[PDB]
């Protein structure tokens, strides 16, 4: 009984992991391991880079 | 109910209007369209120094 729950917090850990998005873009299955930059300045090379991992 | 708040304020911050820069907008062009008025009633005044010349 103890290990059929451990199980299905399990499945849930990974259906969070692979199912959260912005709009279509997922977030969390390693789309971001090596960051996406944003430039936040006027001028190139003005920019932030957004690391997530998997 | 975490991620459905997350991207309403993403959505909000693409969509939605700021009230305090719109209405300084609107008042500047206000004013504007007061000057413009004016300014082009007296221009349609020029061609009366033909009559002073005549």
Known sequence: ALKAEMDQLANEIDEIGKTTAFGTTKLLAGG??????????AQDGEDIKVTVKA | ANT???????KSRIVDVDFAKETSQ???????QQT???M?????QLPQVALSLL
């Open chain 1, 32 to 41: 971001f391991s090596a960051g996406k930059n944003f430039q936040v300045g």
């Open chain 2, 4 to 10: 459905q708040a997350n991207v309403a304020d993403a």
């Open chain 2, 26 to 32: 609107m008042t500047k062009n206000q004013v504007l």
């Open chain 2, 36 to 38: 413009g008025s004016a």
């Open chain 2, 40 to 44: 082009l009633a007296q221009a349609n």
